[PDB]
Amino acid sequence: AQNPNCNIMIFHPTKEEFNDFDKYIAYMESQGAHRAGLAKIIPPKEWKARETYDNISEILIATPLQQVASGRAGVFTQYHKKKKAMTVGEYRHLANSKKYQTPPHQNFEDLERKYWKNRIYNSPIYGADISGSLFDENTKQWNLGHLGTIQDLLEKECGVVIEGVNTPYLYFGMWKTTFAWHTEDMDLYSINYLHLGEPKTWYVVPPEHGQRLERLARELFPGSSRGCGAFLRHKVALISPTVLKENGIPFNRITQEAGEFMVTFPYGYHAGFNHGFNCAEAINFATPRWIDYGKMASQCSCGEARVTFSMDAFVRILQPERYDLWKRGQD
Ligand SMILES: O=C(O)CNC(=O)C(=O)O
Ligand SMILES: [Mg+2]
Ligand code: NI
Ligand SMILES: [Zn+2]
Numbered sequence: 001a002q003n004p005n006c007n008i009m010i011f012h013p014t015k016e017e018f019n020d021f022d023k024y025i026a027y028m029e030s031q032g033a034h035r036a037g038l039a040k041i042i043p044p045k046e047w048k049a050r051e052t053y054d055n056i057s058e059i060l061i062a063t064p065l066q067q068v069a070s071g072r073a074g075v076f077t078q079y080h081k082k083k084k085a086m087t088v089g090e091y092r093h094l095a096n097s098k099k100y101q102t103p104p105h106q107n108f109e110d111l112e113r114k115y116w117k118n119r120i121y122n123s124p125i126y127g128a129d130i131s132g133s134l135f136d137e138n139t140k141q142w143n144l145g146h147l148g149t150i151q152d153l154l155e156k157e158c159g160v161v162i163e164g165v166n167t168p169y170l171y172f173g174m175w176k177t178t179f180a181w182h183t184e185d186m187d188l189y190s191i192n193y194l195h196l197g198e199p200k201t202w203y204v205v206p207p208e209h210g211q212r213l214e215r216l217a218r219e220l221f222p223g224s225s226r227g228c229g230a231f232l233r234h235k236v237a238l239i240s241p242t243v244l245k246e247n248g249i250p251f252n253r254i255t256q257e258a259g260e261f262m263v264t265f266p267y268g269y270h271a272g273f274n275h276g277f278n279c280a281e282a283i284n285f286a287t288p289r290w291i292d293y294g295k296m297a298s299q300c301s302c303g304e305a306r307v308t309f310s311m312d313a314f315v316r317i318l319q320p321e322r323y324d325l326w327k328r329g330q331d
Contacts, residue, residue, distance in 0.1 A: 003032025006206035008039065008254045015044040018141045022148065025189075025263070025287055034289075036252060037268025038204040041261040043142065050136040053196045056279070057089030059170070061127035064091065067178055069120040074240035075220050076120050078178060083125060088172060088279075091127055095174035095277035100124060102175040102198065102276040108255050112201060115273050116240045119176055127172030134170065134195050134281055142261065144168045144193060144283045151310070153286040160317050164310030168283040173200070173274030180235045181217070181271040183210070183264075185307050186314045187297040188284040190264045192256070198276030200256045203241060205269040209250045213239075213269050216247050233300035238271060266293035294318045301329035 003009065009031065017024055024041075033039040065080035086094070094100060105111040133145035140146075149166040175198075184190050194200060205213045214232065218225040221237055228234070244251050256262050258278070264270055266289070286294070295318045312330070316323050 003035045006035040008036045009033040010040040015046045034265040039263045059088040068123045074243040077236045124176040126177040130170040150286040162313035171280040173278045177274040182235045187267040187293040192262045192282040195279045197278030202272040207267040228302035230298040230300045233305040303329045
């Protein structure tokens, strides 16, 4: 079996290998990349996402989110308080202000220490989940706005034609902005490209061990767990690496820098934080290997997680028994 210790693998495709996205994902899995839950893909040196980022300041972040924490330093939840709209230019200036800028630090490890020590005491503002793309339309390779759609994948594998569309999202981050422990909707893959700015640190639990993380989470967030049998779908819980180690949860960590892609694999729980002002783009995608995970994916029916239009059809077709109760949650 390849990659039996479930390490995060890093790939350096040639320009030729960068042509066929599906085939390269399947190559990475042939080498065991998926066992980690997360892989890093460094593009060939000939590739670019677009010519420059000099003209992005006028993108609007309609609903910036202030991420307010509650709990203890290593075990906390965050809620998102909606703020007034601002442009990317305004946001970048806010991220660089004394109140929000990255502190002096030695290296990524020192900054990681400072994050876990101090995150809870601040409420950074995240421009998350903004529909759009920063890939040039002329970028033909690994263009996250030109991938094969999940609806088309389901049709190709299972023969059923369904409604729905699949588009990318932009994420504008600042120091301490945080993504909570989650898998993707319907345990899809995701791909994330760090277009610009400061890094993003990732933590991940191998898919084969995801239920270990879930069990810990139910212990650490006991009222959340009573309220909903899939509360990590709410995307509000954080657990530090120290806490994971104390509880014997298998995980790995890696820092993504600008210019790099990360791929999360089905049922690969992940969480992380941004080091400073940055912009990432991400999208969900599927492969044939996903179908079995989509059929088994947990679902939030308490009503909190409230997800896209396009998830309806996935639930309807892959999880018809759940469908009724799940949609009661959506309505
Ligand atoms: O970058 C972020 O804030 C979160 N991204 C993801 O969870 C992802 O790409 O799957
Ligand atoms: Mg602009
Ligand atoms: Ni994700
Ligand atoms: Zn729920």
